[PDB]
Amino acid sequence: PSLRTQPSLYSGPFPFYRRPSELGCFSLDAQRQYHGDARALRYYSPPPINGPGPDFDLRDGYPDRYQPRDEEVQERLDHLLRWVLEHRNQLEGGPGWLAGATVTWRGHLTKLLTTPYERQEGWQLAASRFQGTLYLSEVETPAARAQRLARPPLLRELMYMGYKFEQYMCADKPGGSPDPSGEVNTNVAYCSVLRSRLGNHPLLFSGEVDCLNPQAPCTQPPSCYVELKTSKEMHSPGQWRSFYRHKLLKWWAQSFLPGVPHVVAGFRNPEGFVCSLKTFPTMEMFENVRNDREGWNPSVCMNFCAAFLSFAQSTVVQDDPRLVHLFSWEPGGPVTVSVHRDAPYAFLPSWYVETMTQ
RNA sequence: UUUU
Ligand SMILES: O=c1ccn([C@@H]2O[C@H](CO)[C@@H](OP(=O)(O)O)[C@H]2O)c(=O)[nH]1
Ligand SMILES: [Ca+2]
Numbered sequence: 436p437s438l439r440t441q442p443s444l445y446s447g448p449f450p451f452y453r454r455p456s457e458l459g460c461f462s463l464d465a466q467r468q469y470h471g472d473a474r475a476l477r478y479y480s481p482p483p484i485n486g487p488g489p490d491f492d493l494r495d496g497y498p499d500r501y502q503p504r505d506e507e508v509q510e511r512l513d514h515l516l517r518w519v520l521e522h523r524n525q526l527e528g529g530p531g532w533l534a535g536a537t538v539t540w541r542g543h544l545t546k547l548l549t550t551p552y553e554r555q556e557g558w559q560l561a562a563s564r565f566q567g568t569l570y571l572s573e574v575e576t577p578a579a580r581a582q583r584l585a586r587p588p589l590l591r592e593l594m595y596m597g598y599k600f601e602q603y604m605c606a607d608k609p610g611g612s613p614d615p616s617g618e619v620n621t622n623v624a625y626c627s628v629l630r631s632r633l634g635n636h637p638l639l640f641s642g643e644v645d646c647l648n649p650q651a652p653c654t655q656p657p658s659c660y661v662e663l664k665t666s667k668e669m670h671s672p673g674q675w676r677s678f679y680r681h682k683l684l685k686w687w688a689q690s691f692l693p694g695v696p697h698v699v700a701g702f703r704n705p706e707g708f709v710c711s712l713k714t715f716p717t718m719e720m721f722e723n724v725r726n727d728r729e730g731w732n733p734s735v736c737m738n739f740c741a742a743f744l745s746f747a748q749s750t751v752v753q754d755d756p757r758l759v760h761l762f763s764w765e766p767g768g769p770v771t772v773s774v775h776r777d778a779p780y781a782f783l784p785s786w787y788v789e790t791m792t793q
Numbered sequence: 794u795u796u797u
Binding site: 593596643 | 794795796
């Protein structure tokens with residue numbers, strides 16, 4: 436039993452997707468410690484209007500002022516589960532809403548959305564049903580682990596530059612000014628917890644958020660949030676076209692799911708400076724490929740993700756937090772399923788299970 | 794589950 440991923444099978448009308456609502460938030464601090472508040476949220480602070488153009492040095496501080504998260508620590512859903520536990524009797528939707536929902540990280544859903552168009556990287560998703568609720572947690576594929584261990588030095592510095600860009604664009608207090616002199620600590624994260632629904636599948640998911648724009652006319656989250664991105668500067672119309680067809684699809688998927696309405700991109704030259712900023716409204720991204728024979732279609736993304744959720748819901752019949760259905764996908768094939776019990780795939784921790792039982 |  437498998438699930439095909441070809442875009443032609445999902446070419447129908449755009450499916451129902453509920454306007455996402457923010458249910459709460461949590462922060463992870465410099466020590467990767469959880470706090471149920473917004474202490475890690477930063478505030479959009481672009482270059483002053485009368486000053487010179489941006490000239491952000493994205494390599495400044497590498498690697499002396501870089502404190503990277505330890506990628507061997509596999510946190511899975513743990514931080515989101517703690518939020519849920521601390522809010523289980525305050526969830527909107529009425530009684531038993533959680534029992535009919537699917538719970539995951541925003542980034543897991545992003546990978547589903549782009550699957551009909553992805554040709555390089557596959558994925559694996561572990562699924563467990565517990566008290567009706569379906570939990571989806573990404574598993575690092577063996578190939579992606581090897582790629583991570585063999586990360587080239589230049590790719591490591593480019594990873595730093597994406598985080599450094601945010602430091603040039605965000606301040607710790609509204610109206611404040613950025614401080615690039617500090618350290619880039621990728622243990623720090625602000626996460627928004629959202630409710631949505633795709634087709635008939637209710638969703639509870641969390642996603643890291645880069646910053647809140649206090650200058651935005653709308654200030655009810657998530658509409659006051661801004662997503663920050665970098666990309667290489669482009670000259671040729673063929674370069675812009677390739678950007679529209681590949682990078683923009685992943686920017687759209689990531690920001691559409693939580694309802695983040697703007698992506699602000701910093702374009703960097705070969706020497707590692709950002710000398711151009713451009714805002715991309717999420718709801719206009721598809722306009723750049725709407726009439727492109729090699730473009731992407733948001734309806735294909737969303738219809739496939741709805742089909743996968745229905746495929747997952749029907750495949751995971753047993754309610755058991757120790758049982759895992761592992762969904763595996765590689766480009767050129769369908770999504771396949773295998774069944775596993777206990778370690779290493781089981782991911783719901785006993786401190787969650789036992790508290791939810793009682 | 795952030796980055797490229
Ligand atoms: O991008 C692709 C390419 C192929 N397949 C699927 O891989 C199988 C053999 O080619 C087919 O699925 P079947 O066993 O149900 O017939 C094909 O649809 C996909 O799902 N996505
Ligand atoms: Ca970002």
